[model samples]
Target: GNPMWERDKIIVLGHRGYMAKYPENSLLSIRKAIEAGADGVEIDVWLSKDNKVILMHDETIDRTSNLKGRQKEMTLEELKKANIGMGERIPTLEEVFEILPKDALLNIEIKDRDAAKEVARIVSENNPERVMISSFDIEALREYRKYDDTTIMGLLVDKEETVPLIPKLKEKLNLWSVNVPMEAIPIIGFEKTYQAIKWVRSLGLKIVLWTEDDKLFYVDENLKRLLGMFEVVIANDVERMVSYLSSLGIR
Candidate 1:
């Protein structure tokens, strides 16, 4: 999409599209996140029984709502009855589409490969530019890629220990980056994260860390100090990120 900044500094992405402020994974939340000036927003998708792509998180609605069943097990009608914070019912991916504008960057993470066919169909029908599919399951990403060729793909590697690093990022995956945990930078240590970043970028890939809101020091310790470092930092806090980048005099 021809980003204005290079990979040296991290991009301010809204996690679940300002989930902290409004309703996480709701159409209102997605719209609010974009208005807050997020470089991009992330949404998790799973299939409803009626073969619709619904926006939500968790294997079930236990924590996020009053629902008694799993997200995959529920139909869109059932999910429509569940309250996902602030009395907002879980929305279908199509319902959120009306809130999302064209040319706005999107990061969609698919949880189940079984829903790939429906998800791909929705994105193709919308034809929104600057949208990319992300998932921990490469199979889902691959399946989506099969149906819709225009959209890009992102790999969520929140836990590197579970899978071998190289094998996860191999060419066959059809992924454009490795999205790890932001705290893992300190946990894995900067040197390792640096090495990982170099390795990923060496293969013409990008690195996007999830739920990271370290803007105060992202510029001082991480961004400006290093070259070709983290390409993206998805955060629930957009104000902090925008302030930090603005202080750097970046337009």
Candidate 2:
């Protein structure tokens, strides 16, 4: 797995692929994100009825695609029939691995608790070296660890207090890093988060942050605060956020 904190430059990972440009989790979106100069791309996966790992953010297909049904209930063949926005079809994890560049870093999030082992199997077989598995599901993350110990696993922390657990998880599990929200820095106290970041680094783990920005201004402010603070930033709108970072001559 890739280490963002050790990199010389800021690593901007596309959230759900180029989330603003294409329907999230679509092959097209992931392709566009890498094509548009993102350092890496983030995508989510769910296991279908046939146990095939498919790319999708939601549990159901009603929002991003033409059809409607729980992803866990549909087979890969059935999911392939539905049209995502821009005439894209849902792709399997294997398909995504084939399409992405070999050197590209993938932040693959496990969206379902039951899909961890299957997702881990697919990723370990396909893109183990250049991919990191992230999940808010502690049990799923633990489950993934059981399948493959070599692959990097990131703790997707959504809460402010979870900052304290990074060092603990790193010691207990084979944690390569953590993924926290930008807003959590403030609520968790900059000093606390900063200490936690340093603490994890001492344990040989990286710190990554994800944003929930409503506007470009919010993005700017967040990036400003994040300068020299985080190793990587996951942007929902990869294009604009990268552009903003470039405009400031930060990377």
Candidate 3:
């Protein structure tokens, strides 16, 4: 079994490299998260005009940096100029791979549809066992599957309608997990969400919860139960969430 899934306690992955403390997706932020004892870190990837895989959450650099342009339209040289604060520049996917520890897991979210091929090729060259590729675009996940069949791949589902497609997708894509938002429990109703998760688990697929308010789990017993159902929890506040889960003997 993969170490990520083999762990008895729930795995805690930093949302966008501990975005709460450092610049999201920056090398420093990723390093900080690992140093802070996070099991892994999640990052969003976009391809530059020159076909370089870069770490960025949004389609444009306007939100996270001083520059205001679409990432795909700019060459890597131009995209590198954007300052992501704290004297950090946007990092390339290759650069991130260099810094990532061998034992730490990296969840790479494909933000650009066209980036799938290049991203898959780059990841295939590295230790794929430590990397998990995820995307809302099923085609993008399909593109990745064409390059490597064994690497763990997850489908990111936020829409209520997509819940029914998981089983078929699991067989077609050889998917290992379904990445879902914690808000789905409230929006789709607890029983429905629970039943959906139970169905997904029956197919031997793992569930991952992302970008949830970790503090809520401390007060809400139902939320805690839901949290326990997930194999991994990607959180914005890695340190706090790790501590909270640790208190519950989950880490």
Candidate 4:
């Protein structure tokens, strides 16, 4: 079975490949996250002008790299020119697949809606079971589903409004999970959040929390309890969270 199916313990994934220590979405960052004992690494993918699926978080490379330009406007060769520090360049989706281990989960967040088909083709051709395609764009997920139905698909919902749409989405996409932000708890209210979680679970869908601030889970008793309900948590400090979860007998 895939790691996504294992609900016995909370799975920890490095957000943007251990972004705290290394360049975000770099190959080095991804590899180090796995070495630090994270169950998996989450990376963002955008299609280049040449139609290559490359790792990038923002539409522009300005934030993560020294270069300046839109990611979609550049070719893979052009995008490679930017130095992401430690001599690392932007890696292609294929390059990540080559390095990632078979047993480890690969959570691919689609940054560009147009990248859906290509990502689906590549992931489906390789390890579909271990790969989870997630995106805020419902259309992109739908496009991906059209190409391959076997791979796990997760809908990223950051707002409370989208919470109610999960059932309809589940029916249409056969979604396996719903990914939500940790901030939604406070913003949407704890009771509402819990009810939403319960509703999604009642539909037999797994829940995933993303981009958590480190201190909240440790200091807030309620947040810690809520953390237990999620199948996975994507964090910036994977090493620390992995250790903390292990101390609580979570992993």
Candidate 5:
């Protein structure tokens, strides 16, 4: 029961870097997460053609910024000019490392593999001990692993059918963690998740739940009830969830 994770048993990773307090994925948001004391800040990255890794979630800039095209198509300079929020430029991977000190855990989700490989290399070049890489694409996980097998790599998914794919993936990717989609909380049920935690434990992997919100994930019954099963809860509002988890005698 005492994996290094069990020490931080109920790790609170800030989604989009304390997004509710600051611009989602902006440097300010990252600082807010540090101020709020998140164990880690979970952010998404997409490649910029200038070979820069800018932090933004969507496949395109349409949802979160002023730009209207694929992030990978835009040069870093062009992406920087786009409004991420409040005059903040889209952050290059280097810029992020500068602002977000490697002191805290970094959960970097690689959205595009080619570009992401470069980002992983940059992180490895710095040799920050606490960085972890995750992605929906298995290739990206492969790329990260090639750079460093020691760096934690997680596989993310939500579909109910995806459960069957885990064993092979764990073997193939040599994943250190299973970062399932928050929606799977309901499908698998709390009992199954607990079993899953035990199951992954046997495989030498940790559990990291991702991207749930207060509105979609509340206490009482729905989402909150299912959370007791995770080793880490990466959320949009961790302070609220942490407060709730306090009463359960879980740290």
Candidate 6:
């Protein structure tokens, strides 16, 4: 088993690699997270036009890069031509894995179906123990599941859906974690969310909090109170999160 899976309480993960300070999904963003005392980093993956596994959070590169085009429409060389802030160029999955620290955990979120098998293959071959696969697209996740099972897998769920499908999928995939968006907590209500987390934990699965949520630190004290309910919290600013959690003596 991976030691990261057995890590101490409230593991802090930077969403898209400390995106507040660095370009989202860039290697610099990931490095900033690790440098800022983050336990791990969460990144998004996409397959470039030439079948190269690349790092990108959005379908279109307009927001993050100086270039304007869909990730799928751009080849690796074309992506390299654009500046993703701080003069950082887009990096491949293999490049990120080569630099990532051995002890650090990586959450690779696959929003694109084309990225699933390639990302799974890379993790299985290179960093099987530390990388975790997650996708809101259940079908995409199902596809990746067939490719590899050596690493942990997680199902990402939103708030609008009221069904118990998340836990059901967790059971079906033999997934290691159920990643709940922070937005879902309020809609699900605290009591229900608390009970749901406990229920899932009882079944021996980890609970992960992802995406930006305004509800998290609204009261500051609430975050401290709810800290124990989650195993990992993927945030935008890793340094800020680490500092805040440290202030609460959570680290």
Show pairs that collide, candidate 6: none
Off by over 4 Å in 2: 1-5, 185-204, 214-220
Q: Candidate 1, residues 1-251: lDDT per residue as tens digits?
A: 54432334456767777776787888777777778887667888899877888887777778778768887777788889988887787888777676777666678889888788888877777764566788887678778877876566777876766336544555666666677675656678767866766767777776676754554247446655443456776777767667766786762
TM-scores for candidates 1 onward, in order: 0.87, 0.88, 0.94, 0.95, 0.87, 0.92
Whole-model alpha-carbon lDDT for candidate 6 = 0.80
The digit string of per-residue lDDT tens for model 3 on 130-242 reads 88999999988888788778888889998878878888999999998999777766677768878888888888888888855655444446447775568888888888888
- Winner on lDDT between 2 and 5 is 2
Q: Return the clash pairs for model 2, or none.
A: none
The local distance difference test score of each candidate is: 0.72, 0.79, 0.84, 0.85, 0.73, 0.80
- Ranking of predictions according to lDDT: 4, 3, 6, 2, 5, 1
Clashes of each: 0, 0, 0, 0, 0, 0
Candidate 4 lDDT, 1-251, residue by residue in tens: 45555658677889999987888999999999999998888999999999999999989999889899998999999999999889899999999988889778889999888999899889976777778899998988888888888787789997777888889999899798999777766677777778888888899888888855655556555447686468988889888888887887657
Q: Candidate 5 on 172-219: residue-level lDDT in tens?
A: 887767886656545666567656666766776677877555554563
- The global Cα lDDT (0 to 1) of model 3 is 0.84
Q: Which stretches of model 5 miss by more than 4 angstroms? A: 1-6, 187-198, 215-217, 221-228, 247-249
Please report how far candidate 3 places residue 238 from its true position, in Å: 0.4
Q: Write the per-residue lDDT of candidate 2 for residues 1-251, one digit (tens) a residue.
A: 34532477888888888787788887888888888888888888888999988888888999888899998998888999999888899988888888888878888899987888887777767757778888988888888888878787789888656766776777666887787776755567666766766666677777788865526226337547556656777888877877888898987
Q: Candidate 6 regions off by >4 Å?
A: 160-163, 218-220
| TM-score-superior candidate, 2 or 5 | 2
- Give, for candidate 2, the lowest lDDT window spanning 10 residues: 214-223
Question: Which stretches of model 1 miss by more than 4 angstroms?
Answer: 1-11, 161-170, 212-220, 223-227
